[PDB]
């Protein structure tokens, strides 16, 4: 895993392009993805 680089990702079948940084969001221990009011993947948890 790389960070702070515009890099394509394939996290557990979820594919896209973007810059991956540290997140301060709190996830319940069953949620994988993360959305917003626009309904786009904003945060994802490492499958590993």
């Amino acid at each position: 895993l790389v960070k702070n680089k515009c890099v394509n990702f394939n996290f557990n079948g979820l594919t896209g392009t973007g810059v991956l940084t540290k997140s301060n969001k709190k996830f319940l221990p069953f949620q994988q993805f993360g959305r917003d009011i626009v309904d786009t993947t904003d945060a994802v948890r490492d499958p590993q």
Binding site: K25, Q31, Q32, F33, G34, R35, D36, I37, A43
Partner: peptide, 22 residues
């Protein structure tokens, strides 16, 4: 053998998607 009414029970998480203040 008896009957009651479910006030607000029965709500579960539809999926595994995190949402904040929506």
């Amino acid at each position: 053998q008896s009957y009651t009414n479910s006030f607000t029970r029965g709500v579960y998480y539809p999926d595994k998607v995190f949402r904040s203040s929506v």
